[PDB]
Design a protein around this ligand. Sequence first.
Ligand code: SF4
Ligand code: SF4
Ligand code: SF4
Lengths: 628, 628
Amino acid sequence: KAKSIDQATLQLLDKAKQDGVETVWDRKADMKVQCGFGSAGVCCRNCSMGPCRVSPVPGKGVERGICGATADVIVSRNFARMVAAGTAAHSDHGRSIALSLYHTSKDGDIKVKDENKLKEVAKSFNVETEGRDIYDIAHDVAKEGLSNYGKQLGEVTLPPSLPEKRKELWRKLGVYPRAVDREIAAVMHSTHIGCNADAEAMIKMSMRCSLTDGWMGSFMGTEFSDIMFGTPHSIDTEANLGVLEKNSVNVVLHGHEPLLSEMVVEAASDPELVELAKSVGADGINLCGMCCTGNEVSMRHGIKIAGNFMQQELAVVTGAVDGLIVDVQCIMPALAKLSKSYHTKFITTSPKAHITDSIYMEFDEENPLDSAKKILKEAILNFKNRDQSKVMIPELKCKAILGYSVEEIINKLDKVVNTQIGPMQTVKPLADVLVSGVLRGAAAVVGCNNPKVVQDSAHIETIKGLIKNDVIVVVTGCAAQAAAKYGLLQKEAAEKYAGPGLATVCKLVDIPPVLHMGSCVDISRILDLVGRVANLLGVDMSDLPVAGVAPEWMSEKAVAIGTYVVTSGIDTWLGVAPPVTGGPEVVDILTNKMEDWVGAKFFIETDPHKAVEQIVNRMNEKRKKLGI
Amino acid sequence: KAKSIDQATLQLLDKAKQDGVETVWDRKADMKVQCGFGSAGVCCRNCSMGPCRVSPVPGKGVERGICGATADVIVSRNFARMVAAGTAAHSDHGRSIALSLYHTSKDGDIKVKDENKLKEVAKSFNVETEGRDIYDIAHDVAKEGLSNYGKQLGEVTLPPSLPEKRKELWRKLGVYPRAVDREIAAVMHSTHIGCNADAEAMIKMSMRCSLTDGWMGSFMGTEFSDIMFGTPHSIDTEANLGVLEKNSVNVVLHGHEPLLSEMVVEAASDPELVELAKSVGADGINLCGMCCTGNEVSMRHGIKIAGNFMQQELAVVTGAVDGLIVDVQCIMPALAKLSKSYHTKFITTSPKAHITDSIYMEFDEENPLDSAKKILKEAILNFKNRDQSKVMIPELKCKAILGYSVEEIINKLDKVVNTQIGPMQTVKPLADVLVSGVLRGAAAVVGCNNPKVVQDSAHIETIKGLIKNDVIVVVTGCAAQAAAKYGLLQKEAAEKYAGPGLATVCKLVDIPPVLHMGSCVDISRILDLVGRVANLLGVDMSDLPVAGVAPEWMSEKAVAIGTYVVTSGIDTWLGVAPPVTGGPEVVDILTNKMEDWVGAKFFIETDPHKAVEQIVNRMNEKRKKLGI
Ligand code: SF4
Ligand code: SF4
Ligand code: SF4
């Protein structure tokens, strides 16, 4: 099987073979046939009476663990713990953002750059704004956001875009969210030996936990990031490994937390550091981003995107990365080993993510700019250790357009609003094109890479099929970066891949057929958008012809995302089977009974063409239900 | 090998064999050779790139997971998640207790029964008490306790018994606790794929999380339970399955949450329910407790203890249990299946612990007494379905003495205080006997049963060895219940098993050589006691000749307990190997390097006699260090 559809990826894999270094593909091959029990989710290790493995085939072999737990119980608890872990990752990201908001000041390193956005958020949090200092408002907003994480009395605060009907449905179902850390703790408590042994209740607890990610953690992280670093607008950038410069210092930012990458971008324009880069013999400083931190700095500043998850190692294989600065999440620990074969400084900066044999330079949030300058100076000084004979940068990079926040999308939609009719600054043109049938629907393509799928193949095939069927596509994360590398994030792509209705819409609004809405936490934006559409049409989000796809997901964060997208009322297709096939009841809940609960359900489909067909059929049947 | 050392357990196992029902022992046999990878902790399932298994033997086979994680990384993350799960269980228990405290009223079902204890706790939480209504104080105290769970700004509140030196050591090490749910979330975040890949940092994060269990969650749960339901004092009870009555309704309370069992005890004295029990042909109502809820009601009211963890099924095998009421934690799901073979009504009461095919009667905390009354009425009415031909209650019961809270221990120690010297109401007599060497030390025996060990064998052998070596023993949980069944919780036991110094101390103070300090959350009491001793001697808790033992542990809660006991500075012996042998670095950290950080470390010893010898040697070493 081919390892990737990306030519630059293939060239660097040949180079890695020539250099005698191992990749994620090599380790996947070394793992050989993976354990069937773990793959089906019928293995349990929740107590030291175990490990227990029960048969993935009902009626044969061992039926219960030592405590008496069935295959359905073991599967449901394993799934719930994946959701809890994903929720924890996203919530910790949002908590750091809220703490940064709490420390903003007029003369400090972290300021308020979008005051209108802050005032709207303050309105959503019942924070007074009129005749008040902007930083007093910011601190009050940060306090309310922080209380969302750990309040023990009262109800949490949810964005106004969330329909009232969806909230009432959640309350009736018993999944209405509480404080984020409280829900994570509840899931961890109920999976403990001898607690919850009922699959339906376990799945409902996991949905309840995932809601605190989708609508509170990721949402607050995104909106506070907009407040502090600016709301994204349409902006040009370049993507894929070709963005590395042979004659410049190459600094690659990998990870998820945006404050460090924002401070590194600011430090790169420091005159002393630019002079130092010139003095070490480089033309300048070339900042490139990877994964979600790359998505953030690219959405807000046009920083070039070096690559997505399964390309991170190959970035080092070029031999041109002088510094690789990582914060947390989706940072392959093998990088520490791999950087030994090159001059690269692999720099960890977060106390949450220590990696053995990496260079640890703790990013100081109290003095973010000075700390970022010190880290960047280490990367720049490493340019003297470059071995130019080992350098091979593929001449493969692609132009991309991104920055499509909900605000930017609304601004673009204002173009097709007749001034004599109005209203302006709404999602009404999008609702109109969806209701009329010019657009069949909207689909979110999100998720990681996975060695089980030819890298980027499923993302590209799913996106092309959807836009060919007049389904407008919004992309986040590594899927968005796969689209960027391929060339879908271009206005020209409208006439090259889209169907007639979507091509007309793209021409009228002057947008690409695929809209890059940011990082994984920025999936909250997608929720926001859908909610607005629903609130404009007076229906629940489960009545709309919308869907989400995770063609190549790998992370626990992806599991939590799919769970809260389904719980919000949006059908979700998974291109990688989750470890639930061992529990028939869990499969039936996720793919059949969920529709009775929240009006949406999971679809497991490993063939992208079949997934596109199923998405189109499901959207059409929801349209016929809605009468459009 | 033998299944148990308890004769009543053996008789009921013979009955279960005759009845054709399977027990935990049968399921353990069916599991056969358990997976070596999971047993060593070298299996990972944290992302869907996996499952990954690496060699438990370094230098052989597959070395890294697909992401590049080493065996040490996989082991450390698995261990950290066990700690997080145990912390979540204990913290959820304490959170329910704090909410119950917040809802106390003068004329309500839940009142304040120990005002002096509440005022001392309010002093510890900086809550004013002079000239204030008692319930206003209770509500303020509950608010402070709840803030300990989810505060995002500021420092948490810790009990005054914790030495200042231990706090400073924690701060220097970087494990000083934050809010409980925040620490659980942090641990779950750092184990996500591509985050923390450094074993030392991972272990430190797990220690930090476990501290929020030992000193905040369990501590607050215990103290608020004392405030609402009364501080335990010396009280007599009976233990083992013989406490069941053939001619009475038998109601067995299983689980951990004390509010439900307290309300059931109160409802059992209701005249209407007693009349109803008479009308169904029963002599009366016989409440019996199991596991930690049994420990709570037994400590506070002398409710008979039917048995510990691995006896729960056998309680049903008698055929005399009319109603088995369960709340959360350590409730074998197999009970539901087992209940079909008898008339027993298996009643789940908590939304956190749904069990398939059990009768669900949600315990309403808004009206706790009425809810308990209706649940108890269902149990009483089930007496008409008793089949007396299937009833076999072994005539094996044992007298026990319990109720040894720190307050009760201090009251007992006041007897050996010369009035002309004093002071009174301190732990000074205990400190004196420890310093003089009349007592060699104090050891806490805690933990569950585990089919891997002959049931109760390790508990009894460890306790007898320790008290024979003039080590006073405090017991909690299922170990305490094993001691109760065996007969160690008796004054006579002092002259039958204890060495000369401990026998003299028991005679002078009029206590058993083994002190039952309550449930698993009541291990906080042990911490409290040790802290007081340390504060009286002006030393850290790691300088004292104290130790903790978990001879037969199984639960994630036990892992968290051992972790915070070691982190507090108390050496801990584990009678069951935790899944860490696959990671050499993790083994070295837990058993060797930990002593450099916190002055204590783990000891893994599956032979109880060798464990007693090692405990005595380590205590003598610490005495020689201290000069006593
Ligand atoms: S919780 Fe039950 S099924 Fe899981 S390892 Fe423990 S005994 Fe086995
Ligand atoms: S999933 Fe379970 S059975 Fe399979 S290798 Fe891992 S621990 Fe062993
Ligand atoms: S986190 Fe790493 S070691 Fe664990 S399953 Fe995923 S790829 Fe394998």
